[PDB]
Amino acid sequence: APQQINDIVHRTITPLIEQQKIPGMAVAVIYQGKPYYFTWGYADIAKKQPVTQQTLFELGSVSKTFTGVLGGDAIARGEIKLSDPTTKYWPELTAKQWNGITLLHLATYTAGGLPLQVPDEVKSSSDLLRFYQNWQPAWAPGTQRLYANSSIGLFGALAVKPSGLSFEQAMQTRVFQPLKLNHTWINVPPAEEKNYAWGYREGKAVHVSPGALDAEAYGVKSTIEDMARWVQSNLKPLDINEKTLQQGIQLAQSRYWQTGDMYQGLGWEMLDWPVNPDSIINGSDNKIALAARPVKAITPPTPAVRASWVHKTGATGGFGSYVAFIPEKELGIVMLANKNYPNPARVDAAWQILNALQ
Ligand SMILES: *C(=O)[C@@H](NC(=O)c1c(-c2ccccc2)noc1C)[C@@H]1N[C@@H](C(=O)O)C(C)(C)S1
């Protein structure tokens, strides 16, 4: 790294680790397009295994960025349209409240109040159908945003149906492989288990539990190198050789809805750059992140704006992640930690680094 990058990163992240008691962390900065890596602490505290550039972390809800791009790619292939009713792709979904709810609504949390989590009691396919059939919207579609794993997760499952591929197979063949993300996984293979960090929640080593629509909402695991490659791809989609994938990246960074200073993409969320750091820092707090917020439709959606702060936070019980990038500046960061610590501390650290380098 240039010494400048080294210093800004270390003088930001070292205190963050100390204050939040994070056991292990990995950071990548993308600066003028090139990645620089940094690692601290432990992947496995009991086995004294350090964090390396090969360590897998649970991305949690950052997974949604992959789901949003995979959907984008399906739209670009002509397999699905965001304007399609949900019922086109799940004809068993006959309940009247679904009339008017499109794939766009599912993808952008605007279906009318689908809940944050799919209930833990949903264990099978018929349980899932029952859940969505019996869900009662609080709101008309396209009026309020309520962040929901059950919303984007269903989008993900539906989006891959016409391909005939499972979500995991579609993701591997259409996103991970073409982008050379060869250490990024929905299900960690045995060959990579020795690199799979433990997450830490109240001092206990934990991994994410199986759950309905986990793959689509929160189930990706990846290394700091692959995630830097993911930032590079989203920074410069027009360099990707796969046509539909290049377009799906763009579509995921299109602005569909606005609530305050924030625009909703497919998975990604965006703000105009330059950004007021109090907008993003405080906005990342979960009482704000997860609130019911009225949205304004952006009619038609604005294509990916290069002058944007594009970002996503994620957590599992044992991990905390953050990704942000600024396409106009060829600049981005990935922060992966094996403790779930507050979003505002992530975003503050990220902005401190990127603002210094900008
Ligand atoms: C994605 O990261 C989602 N995470 C979870 O639903 C989740 C949690 C959790 C942590 C904190 C509060 C509620 C749930 N534990 O295990 C899982 C699988 C959602 N996105 C996050 C984000 O940062 O956008 C949250 C914290 C808003 S929940």
Provide the domain count of the chain.
1
Q: Give me ligand 1 centre to Cα 252, in Å.
A: 20
Closest-CA residue, ligand 1 atom 26, reads: 315
Technique of determination: X-ray
Distance (Å, whole) CA 54 – CA 71: 28
Look up the domain containing 317 and give its range.
Answer: 1-358
Q: Which of 120, 208, 284, 286 to mutate to test the pocket of ligand 1 (most atoms within 8 A of CB)?
A: 286
Catalytic residue ranges: 61
Q: Return the ligand 1 atom nearest residue 340 CA.
A: 10
Q: Return the ligand 1 atom nearest residue 64 CA.
A: 1
The CATH number given to whatever domain includes residue 342 is: 3.40.710.10
**Is 163 flagged in the annotation as binding?**
no
Give the per-residue SS3 of the chain: CCHHHHHHHHHHHHHHHHHHCCCEEEEEEEECCEEEEEEEEEEECCCCEECCCCCEEECHHHHHHHHHHHHHHHHHCCCCCCCCEHHHHCCCCCCHHHCCCEHHHHHCCCCCCCCCCCCCCCCCHHHHHHHHHHCCCCCCCCCEECCCHHHHHHHHHHHCCCCCCCHHHHHHHHHHCCCCCCCEECCCCHHHHHHECCEEECCEEECCCCCCCHHHHCCCEECHHHHHHHHHHHHCHHHCCCHHHHHHHHHHCCEEEEECCEEECCCCEEEECCCCHHHHHHHHCHHHHCCCEECEEEEEEECCCCCEEEEEEEECCCCEEEEEEEHHHCEEEEEEECECCCHHHHHHHHHHHHHHHC
CB of 211 closer than 6 A to ligand 1? Answer: no
Distance (Å, whole) CA 358 – CA 351: 10
Q: Return the ligand 1 atom nearest residue 116 CA.
A: 6
Q: Which of 186, 207, 316 to mutate to test the pocket of ligand 1 (most atoms within 8 A of CB)?
A: 316
**Is 340 flagged in the annotation as binding?**
yes
Q: Give me ligand 1 centre to Cα 128, in Å.
A: 20
CA-nearest of 121, 99, 119 to 111 is 99
